[PDB]
Amino acid sequence: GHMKYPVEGGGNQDWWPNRLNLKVLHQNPAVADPMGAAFDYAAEVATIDVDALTRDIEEVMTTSQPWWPADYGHYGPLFIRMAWHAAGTYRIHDGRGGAGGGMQRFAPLNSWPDNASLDKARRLLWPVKKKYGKKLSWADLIVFAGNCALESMGFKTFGFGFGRVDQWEPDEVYWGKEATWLGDERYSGKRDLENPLAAVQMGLIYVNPEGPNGNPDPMAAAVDIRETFRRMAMNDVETAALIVGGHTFGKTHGAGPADLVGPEPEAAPLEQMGLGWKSSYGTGTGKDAITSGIEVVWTNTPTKWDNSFLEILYGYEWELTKSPAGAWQYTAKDGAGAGTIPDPFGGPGRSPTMLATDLSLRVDPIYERITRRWLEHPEELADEFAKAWYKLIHRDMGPVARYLGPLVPKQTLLWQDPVPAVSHDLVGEAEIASLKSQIRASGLTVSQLVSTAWAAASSFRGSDKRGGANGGRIRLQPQVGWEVNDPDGDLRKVIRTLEEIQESFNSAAPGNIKVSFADLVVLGGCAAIEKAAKAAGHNITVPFTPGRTDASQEQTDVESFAVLEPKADGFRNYLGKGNPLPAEYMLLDKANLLTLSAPEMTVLVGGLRVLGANYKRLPLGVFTEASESLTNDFFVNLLDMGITWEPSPADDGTYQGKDGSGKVKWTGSRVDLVFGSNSELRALVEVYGADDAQPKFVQDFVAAWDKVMNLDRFDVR
Amino acid sequence: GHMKYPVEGGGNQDWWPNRLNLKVLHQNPAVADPMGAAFDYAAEVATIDVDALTRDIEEVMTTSQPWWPADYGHYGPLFIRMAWHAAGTYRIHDGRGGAGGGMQRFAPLNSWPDNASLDKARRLLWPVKKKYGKKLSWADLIVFAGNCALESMGFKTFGFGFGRVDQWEPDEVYWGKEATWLGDERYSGKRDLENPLAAVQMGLIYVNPEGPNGNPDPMAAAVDIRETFRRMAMNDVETAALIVGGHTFGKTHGAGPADLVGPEPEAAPLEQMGLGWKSSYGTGTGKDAITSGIEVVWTNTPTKWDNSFLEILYGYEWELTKSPAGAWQYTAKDGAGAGTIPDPFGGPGRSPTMLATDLSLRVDPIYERITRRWLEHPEELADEFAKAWYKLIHRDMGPVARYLGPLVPKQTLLWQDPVPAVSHDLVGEAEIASLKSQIRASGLTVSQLVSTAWAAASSFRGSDKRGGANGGRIRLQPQVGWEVNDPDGDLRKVIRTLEEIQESFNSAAPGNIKVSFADLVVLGGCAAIEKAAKAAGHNITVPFTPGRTDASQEQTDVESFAVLEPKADGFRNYLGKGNPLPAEYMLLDKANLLTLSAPEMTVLVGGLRVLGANYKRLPLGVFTEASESLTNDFFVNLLDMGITWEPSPADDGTYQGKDGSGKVKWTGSRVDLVFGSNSELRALVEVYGADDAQPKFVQDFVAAWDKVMNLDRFDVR
Numbered sequence A, B: 001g002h003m004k005y006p007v008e009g010g011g012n013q014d015w016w017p018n019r020l021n022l023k024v025l026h027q028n029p030a031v032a033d034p035m036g037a038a039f040d041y042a043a044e045v046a047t048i049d050v051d052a053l054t055r056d057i058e059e060v061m062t063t064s065q066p067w068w069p070a071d072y073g074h075y076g077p078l079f080i081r082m083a084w085h086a087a088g089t090y091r092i093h094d095g096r097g098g099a100g101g102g103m104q105r106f107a108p109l110n111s112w113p114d115n116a117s118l119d120k121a122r123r124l125l126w127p128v129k130k131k132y133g134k135k136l137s138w139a140d141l142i143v144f145a146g147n148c149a150l151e152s153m154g155f156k157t158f159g160f161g162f163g164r165v166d167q168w169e170p171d172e173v174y175w176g177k178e179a180t181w182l183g184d185e186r187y188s189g190k191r192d193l194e195n196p197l198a199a200v201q202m203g204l205i206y207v208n209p210e211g212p213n214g215n216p217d218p219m220a221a222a223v224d225i226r227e228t229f230r231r232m233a234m235n236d237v238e239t240a241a242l243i244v245g246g247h248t249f250g251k252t253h254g255a256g257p258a259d260l261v262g263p264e265p266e267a268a269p270l271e272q273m274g275l276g277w278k279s280s281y282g283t284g285t286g287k288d289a290i291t292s293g294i295e296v297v298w299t300n301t302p303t304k305w306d307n308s309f310l311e312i313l314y315g316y317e318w319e320l321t322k323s324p325a326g327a328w329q330y331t332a333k334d335g336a337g338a339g340t341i342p343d344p345f346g347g348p349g350r351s352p353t354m355l356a357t358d359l360s361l362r363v364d365p366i367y368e369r370i371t372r373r374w375l376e377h378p379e380e381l382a383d384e385f386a387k388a389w390y391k392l393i394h395r396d397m398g399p400v401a402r403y404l405g406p407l408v409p410k411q412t413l414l415w416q417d418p419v420p421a422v423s424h425d426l427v428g429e430a431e432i433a434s435l436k437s438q439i440r441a442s443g444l445t446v447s448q449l450v451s452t453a454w455a456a457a458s459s460f461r462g463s464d465k466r467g468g469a470n471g472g473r474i475r476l477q478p479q480v481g482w483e484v485n486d487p488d489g490d491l492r493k494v495i496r497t498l499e500e501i502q503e504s505f506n507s508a509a510p511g512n513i514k515v516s517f518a519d520l521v522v523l524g525g526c527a528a529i530e531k532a533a534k535a536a537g538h539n540i541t542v543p544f545t546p547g548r549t550d551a552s553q554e555q556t557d558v559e560s561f562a563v564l565e566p567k568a569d570g571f572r573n574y575l576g577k578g579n580p581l582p583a584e585y586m587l588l589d590k591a592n593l594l595t596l597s598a599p600e601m602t603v604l605v606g607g608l609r610v611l612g613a614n615y616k617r618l619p620l621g622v623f624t625e626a627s628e629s630l631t632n633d634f635f636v637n638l639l640d641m642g643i644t645w646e647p648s649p650a651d652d653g654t655y656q657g658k659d660g661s662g663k664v665k666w667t668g669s670r671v672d673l674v675f676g677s678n679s680e681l682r683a684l685v686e687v688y689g690a691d692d693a694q695p696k697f698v699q700d701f702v703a704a705w706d707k708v709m710n711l712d713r714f715d716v717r
């Protein structure tokens, strides 16, 4: 190999291939963002003319362009596929992928095989982005175009929320180890898909449309359909709704040989202006289009919503055949339906075809049962598709406070993890002061208070913006029983005391000020940090924003919340079984999910350690003689050359730190020592371990604690 | 191969390995910086007691630590090597390297083989950094330790300037293509060394202490010393003075086999807490230290400044021999000087030794003349050494206005590319106003005005902070005949014209006010942009900051300014020969040298295009119908799907863009089309090409224009 210029990707990773990469802690850095610091997308899109935008998209959808002519003179089905693929990278294990960031316009997603031809589709919408400018993100426009497509063609949607914020640099995501497009090294056991992946091969959205590994067996395919769609928050009824409603529209593209399609967009020459997959087959477009290389037209009305898709699936029998590109598909037996299905550009008319994955809907017995009932009762399909599509293109939007505009339905949805509206006056400064003192008199230790508040708030992940302290869910299932939150039952004692303080405050409060359990969880930790800072000779006030509300168990989907359980939390020195990488990688990933910078992550670790936030309160990384004191001791001691460090002889992922006499003075994990070992992190430790650094450390720790407590609080932003 | 998680370094570079890497335009991002945005290092270091700091550093030098015991009970010599290596990565071709960012503490430099044992060196200074905190950067501390070491041991230095701001991530720099440490793939012909490198092997500071490629030919070694030191701005006298001055102190370390030396610090295990090359030979330290593999102690007084180096070098005859670790070195013939050279830990006392590269000082004709003199005139060595040492450790400081603290001698030095003090009062507003007019009332066009300003300001590179518009050196040699600046034409007229307006204002001016050529060259470009903005219907004012002053040709080291000649400037669509990478990479690299973000580069390219900034007024990229109007036409037209691009038949490196009627309507280079082809650049273009973007584009253009105008203006901030 050969080292390259930094402008061509050279860097320290080439000399140290498994190097912890801190650039995950500064994604989308402000210097790369072209808008001012005052720029508030939510404010711009809040003033958009939605009706005007609908007409302009309608106009685009029916004005064929010569560089990519429009099947049946309507771009709608292309745009449905576009939005579906944009939202369809979402996966539940880490909440990443999805439509929320407009990531389909950037690498690698803009060059995935499954996104072939969506480069043209995005390009067709530049007229619309052009006219609305900063009032309309690409992220919002991409999925709104699909939503408008549906309604254009006869299907009434549930609603729509604007507010997805455009970004300027692709989120770098782990999409699998396979270094070959469409490779599959992601199954073990009996067909167990590698976590966190939610697609069956590298560069597919969900499943192979020719069946598992290109074997067009509808029964087997359905197993992949069910599991990948599960991993994208869709159950049996939603998955069936989505496939049937999607393939009510449009057609597939495989007019000629695949080997005549050029490089994907990121690999194409400059002259193609970001377009890829340039084809030399015929005109290379339109009548000659090659996208997947399958050539199916599901229904006789590809630009109208109706029940044709299921009427056709069940009203013919199907035999296996080959498209012009040589791909597996199904056509109707015995020349039935010959010439019943229209051509995209006026041609002679063709006979019914379905994909292998489509037959799964009638060959798999669960799917058969659902789709047959919709054959008989189509109105039920419309309802399920509407709910499913709405969830699909909004799944990663975060709390409902983020949904903007005149198309947002008012109804509450379980999958949104709803919290109640505020129903009383919120606590002011005086009640906040009083309540902090009451928490400090309750008997709860600094350690219990800080760790409870951290447990509740750090459940937020910035990918899909699920989790967090709002909702008071730490006292509900499943959070109340997560191993990291509740090693020893200590959490229930905390919850009880905070509930008693809530009750007594609320029954005594002055005229209709009430406080939620959710707020007192966070407030309690803020109060403990004030006390520990006073124990260390600093008088500081920890900020606090009231307005969290308490969800009930019935408004908390227990199984949906399963994916938010931490398997690793370096901030609590917790490391469960099953993580993909060593502990320090996991910490970085946890910091990334909390939206933390490297300095923010660094001060929280050092503060949390000396505050006693450690899982099971064990002494790893607790490099201080003081108890519940907010000092910078963690950084001073980590830089003490009087300590010698060696892996503990027990080979247990811990380290022994000995002073000059040889006596073991400190112990620590990989997560503790990586701050003393990694040259970028140690640089940060040297800032916070200086003689002059303690006031800055308290100050920056309180700011990062405040940030983490406030992560899900879009109701005040 | 296998793709990795992003936290383990994986990303889009792996699918497309030669892609344009925009990270080079957001180095040292602000979210990674632990200090405030308000942090002001000049204000912090101003408060430092330099005497107390000197004394504290002297404590460190004479207090030996057990984990790296001090040769001769004095760490001074080790710190001088540390300082010399900190500064010894600098190179004139791009000005990268140097001590000015403290980059020795980060990867890759912290782990170069030539930087072995300096991990221990930097570690020993932590007690100092701990005490001074944010008032003293590591970057300052590392070279100031070397300087203090010199003074400590009886050498009076010329001075020292503080002011190097610490950074938080490695500056990523192309150090060569060899993927092997010490590997050699950088030579062609008879010892022609690959540009832009200044070292003979990968991970060496300058040359191989055993002679080229381990061939201990002192005559041939001097060839590489002369060439490597010249590429770090040192001539023959400075180079001989540096080596003699350095090797007056300390020793090398090669007490046993190097296969007993463990991994370099970026590879070493967590428990080593940032240190590396852990060694199982003997105690692995002190008596048993192994650093380079050589074992030479040059003088009989390793902790004292005197003339022993050259007296030994010349007073003995030298024969080849092998260090305990199999390294080539020289020793005294005839057993002369037995037992005369003292042991660093009380051992018996040894014979004289020299490196092969030391012998070059006596073998090479040119060095031998210089050093023969110093054998009888140590006062001249001492003088040249102080001058050269001072220049080595300040080469990348930028303008003199930046040198901070009480140890800066006022004497002007030519290598600092000096500019005169402000002789008179400075043009005020009313004055500034009137002179825009006289310049608009000249026959100077927006094209020549804007282009001449840019030509001057854009000579600044942020690597070593040389260059820029202060000094008015555009009218001097060499800038005035740089192929890019005046392809044989308009320059001299703009120069001649602007000088005339200098008199007309000066020969008649209000009181003590005068104005420099340098300040007009900039203000010219400025008022032009006010004109081109008017022609586009926006009334705006471009900021301008007076204060520049004219240097003489006599104050302009013509050769020193040669390395500042653009072989490439995408902002003027100029692409000379010799460039190591295709045009679009040269574009990003030039924007990095100008400290520009990606949004800044984008607005600047679009804006200058439509002002005629182009080399030879070429039509490439000038996507506008307007003459000297400042619109966003470049962006709008770039995104025009009505245009079709293909490479010019000519194989020019140009492209034609045809309208529907097959007519060429635009032409462009790689640099122009990359803004429409690269997925991240095109995102920026779509911000500025939108309907509502004209005011914002002008604003950001001016703000970015201001920034490039002010790059060298450290005298005002």
Ligand code: HEM
Residues within 6 Å of the ligand: A071, A077, A078, A080, A081, A084, A117, A206, A207, A208, A209, A225, A242, A243, A245, A246, A247, A249, A250, A251, A252, A253, A254, A290, A291, A292, A293, A294, A357
């Ligand atoms: C089993 C999962 C699915 C598979 C395997 C699948 C596969 C495909 C394939 C291969 C194409 C043809 C691509 C081409 O060459 O042009 C296609 C087209 C399409 N799919 Fe899917 N699909 C799935 C689910 C969905 C879903 C959930 C939707 C949306 C609700 C959807 C909507 C569409 C649409 C609209 C097209 C038509 C594009 C056009 O008219 O140009 N599909 N699908």
Ligand code: HEM
Residues within 6 Å of the ligand: B071, B077, B078, B080, B081, B084, B117, B206, B207, B208, B209, B225, B242, B243, B245, B246, B247, B249, B250, B251, B252, B253, B254, B290, B291, B292, B293, B294, B357, B389
């Ligand atoms: C041709 C140029 C040079 C070569 C080939 C060279 C080579 C070396 C080598 C191989 C070592 C051994 C390090 C070890 O094993 O501990 C060393 C040490 C040293 N170098 Fe040089 N060097 C050069 C220039 C300089 C310069 C320009 C300076 C200062 C201005 C300098 C100052 C020192 C000092 C003080 C030591 C002793 C450090 C100690 O006592 O640990 N060297 N040099």
Ligand code: NA
Residues within 6 Å of the ligand: A248, A249, A299, A300, A301, A302, A303, A304, A305, A306, A307, A308, A309
């Ligand atoms: Na239909």
Ligand code: NA
Residues within 6 Å of the ligand: B248, B249, B299, B300, B301, B302, B303, B304, B305, B306, B308, B309
């Ligand atoms: Na000496």
